[PDB]
Design an enzyme around this catalytic site. Structure first.
Site, mmCIF file in Angstrom:
data_model
loop_
_atom_site.group_PDB
_atom_site.id
_atom_site.type_symbol
_atom_site.label_atom_id
_atom_site.label_comp_id
_atom_site.label_asym_id
_atom_site.label_seq_id
_atom_site.Cartn_x
_atom_site.Cartn_y
_atom_site.Cartn_z
ATOM 1 N N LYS A 135 0.884 -1.177 0.000
ATOM 2 C CA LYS A 135 0.000 0.000 0.000
ATOM 3 C C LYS A 135 0.920 1.225 0.000
ATOM 4 C CE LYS A 135 -2.930 1.319 3.928
ATOM 5 N NZ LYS A 135 -3.171 1.563 5.445
ATOM 6 N N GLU A 161 12.184 -0.644 -0.528
ATOM 7 C CA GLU A 161 12.655 -2.007 -0.703
ATOM 8 C C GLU A 161 11.834 -2.743 -1.763
ATOM 9 O OE1 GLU A 161 12.087 -0.656 2.463
ATOM 10 O OE2 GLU A 161 13.351 -1.708 3.970
ATOM 11 N N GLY A 194 -1.270 -2.272 7.256
ATOM 12 C CA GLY A 194 -0.416 -3.305 6.691
ATOM 13 C C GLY A 194 -0.323 -4.567 7.540
ATOM 14 N N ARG A 195 -0.092 -4.415 8.842
ATOM 15 C CA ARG A 195 0.026 -5.569 9.749
ATOM 16 C C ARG A 195 -1.312 -6.240 10.061
ATOM 17 N NH1 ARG A 195 1.372 -0.794 12.299
ATOM 18 N NH2 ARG A 195 -0.104 -0.142 13.928
ATOM 19 N N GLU A 247 4.460 -3.481 16.617
ATOM 20 C CA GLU A 247 4.265 -2.260 15.843
ATOM 21 C C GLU A 247 2.943 -1.582 16.219
ATOM 22 O OE1 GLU A 247 3.762 -1.995 11.458
ATOM 23 O OE2 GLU A 247 5.896 -1.431 11.526
ATOM 24 N N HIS A 251 14.770 -26.960 23.343
ATOM 25 C CA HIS A 251 16.160 -27.344 23.337
ATOM 26 C C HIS A 251 17.072 -26.164 23.053
ATOM 27 C CE1 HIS A 251 14.661 -31.407 23.551
ATOM 28 N NE2 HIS A 251 13.938 -31.215 22.470
ATOM 29 N N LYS A 290 13.687 6.227 8.164
ATOM 30 C CA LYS A 290 13.524 6.368 6.713
ATOM 31 C C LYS A 290 14.080 7.699 6.232
ATOM 32 C CE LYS A 290 9.281 3.700 6.440
ATOM 33 N NZ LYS A 290 7.808 3.893 6.195
#
Lengths: 555, 556
Positions: free
Chosen positions: B210, B216, B271-272, B357, B388, B518
């Protein structure tokens, strides 16, 4: 406990109580344009450089001096010498601690009970080299005469995480090696989805277990052998497709494994320090033995750095001391490891074991309970991905989180004339700069006016756009992530963990904390069989079991 | 801050001060043989049961009553209705918060600025369904006439983690679907090593963002398009191999993708919280749109549970409240998510974004700084692998770590007549039992004596074998990890996160914290070109840059 009673620790505490509010990174950097030079190390290994920049930490020269004095007072150097001399410093188990012997490229003698271990170390390495050459060249053939295309490592914990993390990190160096697969979970999904992708005729299984009696590993190993024999039928074919990393010759032979394909290691190799041993066989198969030797040689280089360098300039010591400062003085529960490198995507997960199982402890050498914190919770994801997942909280939450940012200067994939790696580097640098500097109310106000916000708009949004900053980080930058460089980096953190454990007076090399869960699982297994209600535990364990039995037969 | 001034919170903090040293789980269970009945919920979704067992928590009935009283005092129910009714509860951005609209299978109208969003939600779903049928059946051909065999999602953060977690979790449902690949890191390793495994004639790229300006993602997309055209040459072949998932029609068109290959979502999809939207296209391609609809239906069920259930029996509310207790009274920094399921190996990582976030915040609705803790650090690995690795610290370290243990009763792979899953279930149960019970000095001494230790060796070892216990857990057990049930479980934690945010008076739905990094990366970028020393920053940033420049030219 020893730490709390140490006068240098008390001195450090008193300074922190008096002077905490002087520790503002913006002010410190504005007041000392030489700060980077005072609080960084550059290491030339002759196979790449390592810059350990610790200048964005909430320290002054006086704090660093106090921290080095604490390592002296707590006897770090003498403990280090006991480690390297083969003394039984794993004192609850009465065992030496000699992962450093596994990579002792110098072959200087190291004695355990007056007997040099180095010939046995080198004997196993020579068997690894021979076997690797036979498999990779196509000389070793499966039961129908086909060369090996897939190597499946079955093992848990230390038998799994190191070899996986390294083969992931060194994937560019695997040309000419078989594909490697790692099956660790007892969850049958893990072996089943792996076996569905494999051809029995061309698959080699590596069963990794000292005892060859480990429950999850041997159950997975038996499932693989059943799958294999459903194809091959002939029990004698197992010896062409199964080898062991173990010392139990009898159990290995009983499984169907030729005992000359047992790759041995020793009780002074802890699982979470074992990738340097026979446990690394899958590494050497994947990237070749020459590259495995380079991995060992990098670790050896950092072992010497740790042994010969004054404490005040000694990288693992300084990393350890910074961590002590944040844990025992600032009270930070966690430590984030953030490699800006997709090949290192399992690096943080590896040091979850290496750090947390080592120093997640609470009884000291004298048997006394600690009255201070010990090891932190280690976590992280590779950058830049973590930036779009959780960095919101690191920047603007309510938690102080020491972060290690790591990156290679040179990429294995310089695509687009370097554009991708340039953007990666720029984010690596910007994030630690942002964490340090933040953004003041005045600075954010200026931005909002320039953007044209109405006055009431601006006052509304303004506090949300402020970054308090003062969030400390380490930046660890190295020329290139080669096998040698990875070895040096892993060893560095191994010795950091050691130094912290000596300072806390705990045993970094035992793991008594895993026994209770094992004992209780063995009691529950037989109770799950059949339909009877269970009443023999607390009300919650019973209730869960009875829900499980109820839902077994739901459609 | 609002929470600190709330009278029910103050009553909680007092109860904690006066009775904290009274909460021992062994004693609670010994005193109350009905403790499991009183401190667990059973939900029948009609598509699997969910047992949320919160009885191994350091709570009594009085604490739970005080916690629900806090939820009412902080106004959780009204805030919930605001979200579901389409009000602009993302108040710093002036946006609605409507991931529940994306999975609103009942198609009840939800208005934003006076218009029902559901017709457009469903138009995009119908577009997704038609596209998935065409690609999966072989109807959709590449530039040389071949069927699609590989789907590659290019996206980061919310455009990556969700779809990845779900395709990994639902891998058994992907028979007959193309392989899916996720490219997210700007690190050129990620796209390079992926493209080397692909044939341009049968690979379909999905560019997810969006904004469609995420640096990136657009850089990765341009790298993929360059690679593709190296083989295909003809720019019109791009419309057969590249689609877009975005809110920005114009940025998508400016990248050169055909506009009927755009799958839209909306500013009120965070977004999340976005895997339920067009962003889920790679899920639907891999497991089929019918399984995607089941995933949505699962979330929809939990949405209705959250909306209609009294607070004291409401699963996301109760999870939220227990988190508040451990965060704001006990001071625990972290929350561990430990699914005993290899298919869920990326579940904790997904909720690192979803939780941290959202609630990694420090400014309240009134613009006041919080004076209390907010969201925890979320971490974990699937069992038994984590067992473990780091459970030593959970059992015998110096940190209190609330853990959620999750497991399906029924495995997707019942190999060896159930043996593996029997052992996995046993470990799932034993670990929380062990964390609760511990092992006293007296019990450890008796074991060591029975094992024949000398008195010297016994006394040397004894303290190291003691487990203090009293370490609290949730156990979340569910019939089977199907598409529906995964949807219900993800939605349950979404609403947990919402409730905690309302209690802390923060905005769960913005993310101003990502901006400064950013902006600073944009300034550094041009400075890395060329060999000149950089002097324009603080000394550390300069020194790092200059070491990078030195070592760029090193031959190792």
């Amino acid at each position: 406990a020893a730490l709390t009673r140490d006068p240098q620790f008390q001195k450090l505490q008193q300074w922190y109580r008096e002077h905490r509010s002087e520790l503002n990174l913006r002010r410190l950097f504005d007041a000392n344009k030489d700060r980077f030079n005072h609080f960084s190390l550059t290491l030339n290994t002759n196979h790449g450089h390592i810059l350990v920049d610790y200048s964005k930490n909430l320290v002054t020269e006086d704090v660093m001096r106090m921290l080095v004095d604490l390592a002296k007072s707590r006897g770090v150097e003498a403990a280090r010498e006991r480690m390297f001399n083969g003394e039984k410093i794993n004192y609850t188990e009465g065992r030496a601690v000699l992962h450093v012997a596994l990579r002792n490229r110098s072959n200087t003698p190291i004695l355990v009970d007056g007997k040099d271990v180095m010939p046995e170390v080198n004997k196993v390495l020579d068997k690894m080299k021979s076997f690797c050459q036979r498999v990779r060249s196509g000389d070793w053939k499966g039961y129908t005469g086909k060369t090996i295309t897939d190597v499946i490592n079955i093992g848990i914990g230390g038998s799994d995480l190191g070899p996986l993390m390294v083969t992931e990190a060194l994937k560019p160096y695997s040309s000419g090696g078989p594909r490697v697969w790692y099956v660790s979970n007892i969850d049958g999904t893990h072996i089943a989805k792996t076996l569905a992708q494999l051809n029995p005729e061309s698959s080699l299984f590596i069963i990794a277990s000292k005892t060859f009696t480990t429950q999850e590993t041997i159950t997975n190993a038996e499932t693989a052998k059943e799958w294999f024999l459903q194809a091959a039928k002939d029990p004698s074919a197992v010896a062409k497709h199964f080898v062991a990393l173990s010392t139990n010759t009898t159990k290995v032979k009983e499984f169907g494994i030729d005992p000359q394909n047992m790759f041995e290691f020793w009780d002074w190799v802890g699982g979470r320090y074992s990738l340097w041993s026979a446990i690394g066989l899958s590494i050497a198969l994947h990237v070749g033995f020459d590259n495995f030797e380079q991995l060992l040689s990098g670790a050896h280089w950092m072992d010497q750095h740790f042994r010969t360098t004054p404490l005040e300039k000694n990288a693992p010591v300084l990393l350890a001391l910074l961590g002590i400062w944040y844990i025992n003085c600032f009270g930070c529960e966690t430590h984030a490891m953030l490699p800006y490198d997709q090949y290192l995507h399992r690096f943080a997960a590896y040091f979850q074991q290496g750090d947390m199982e080592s120093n997640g402890k609470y009884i000291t050498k004298s048997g006394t309970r600690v009255d201070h914190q010990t090891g932190p919770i280690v976590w992280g994801e590779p950058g830049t991905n973590g930036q779009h997942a959780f960095y919101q909280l690191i920047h603007q939450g309510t938690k102080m989180i020491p972060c290690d940012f790591l990156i290679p200067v040179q990429t294995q994939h310089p695509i687009r004339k370097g554009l991708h790696h340039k953007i990666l580097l720029a984010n690596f640098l910007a994030q630690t700069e942002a964490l340090m500097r933040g953004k003041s109310t005045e600075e954010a106000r200026k931005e909002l006016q320039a953007a044209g916000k109405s006055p009431e708009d601006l006052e509304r949004l303004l506090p949300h756009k402020v970054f308090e900053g003062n969030r400390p980080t380490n930046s660890i930058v190295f020329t290139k992530l080669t096998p040698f460089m990875l070895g040096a980096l892993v060893a560095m953190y191994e010795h950091k963990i050691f130094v912290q454990g000596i300072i806390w007076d705990i045993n970094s090399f035992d793991q008594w904390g895993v026994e209770l869960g094992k004992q209780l699982a063995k009691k529950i297994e037989p109770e799950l069989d059949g339909s009877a209600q269970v009443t023999s535990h607390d009300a919650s364990t019973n209730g869960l079991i009875n829900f499980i039995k109820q839902q077994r037969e739901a459609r």
